[PDB]
């Protein structure tokens with residue numbers, strides 16, 4: 001009787017696949033509200049309203065770096081907006097404001113009859129993702145908006161690592177050999193600061209700073225985990241509890257931690 005459960009029962013194979021069960025379409029945002037540019041990905045056949053996820057790139061970067069998440073997540077039953085920031089050189093606090101503005105605009109479009117996502121979104125169920133400074137921005141978003149249902153930043157950085165205010169379920173993807181935002185001074189301290197949430201830390205063996213970006217060679221695992229985390233926590237969908245919470249016990253993972261999951 002979970003009103004938010006969508007799609008067939010998951011399997012490892014179905015979550016590792018390039019595409020989930022639903023057909024995906026996309027469109028460009030005509031007039032971004034409070035951010036630079038956006039692409040919205042959505043399922044055409046999810047069978048009920050779905051939650052929305054906003055995804056932000058890192059410093060200097062654009063939608064291309066994070067775009068693979070759009071179809072991957074949308075095909076499992078989410079509306080996903082990938083953004084460009086107002087400036088490629090925006091810092092994490094500005095990136096958080098823009099991420100939240102993008103979620104607001106998804107809500108606007110859900111109420112706009114000419115939009116392809118008209119009536120497709122449950123605006124009460126939202127999540128945040130992003131790379132590097134965009135990952136820091138996602139954590140700021142979560143700290144400031146505790147009704148967000150999930151966060152899953154990748155290779156995050158912020159000038160502070162104290163995210164003890166975050167009560168939103170948070171999965172941190174990290175990249176072992178990150179030279180930009182080293183794990184030991186960025187992703188791991190951030191993970192360790194969070195005391196009141198379901199949380200997880202998944203470090204990719206040998207990964208550079210771009211190890212969770214479009215074109216990575218761990219899309220099966222990373223995509224399984226991101227989808228599972230969003231499903232479990234955005235949809236309250238306990239079919240995904242093991243996928244969300246498990247240690248993959250994988251040679252592709254150099255460090256795994258989880259708590260309250």
Ligand SMILES: O=[N+]([O-])c1ccc(O)cc1
Pocket residue numbers: 058059132133156157180181
């Ligand atoms: O953009 N970032 O991910 C950064 C920026 C500066 C820094 O010293 C470390 C990481």
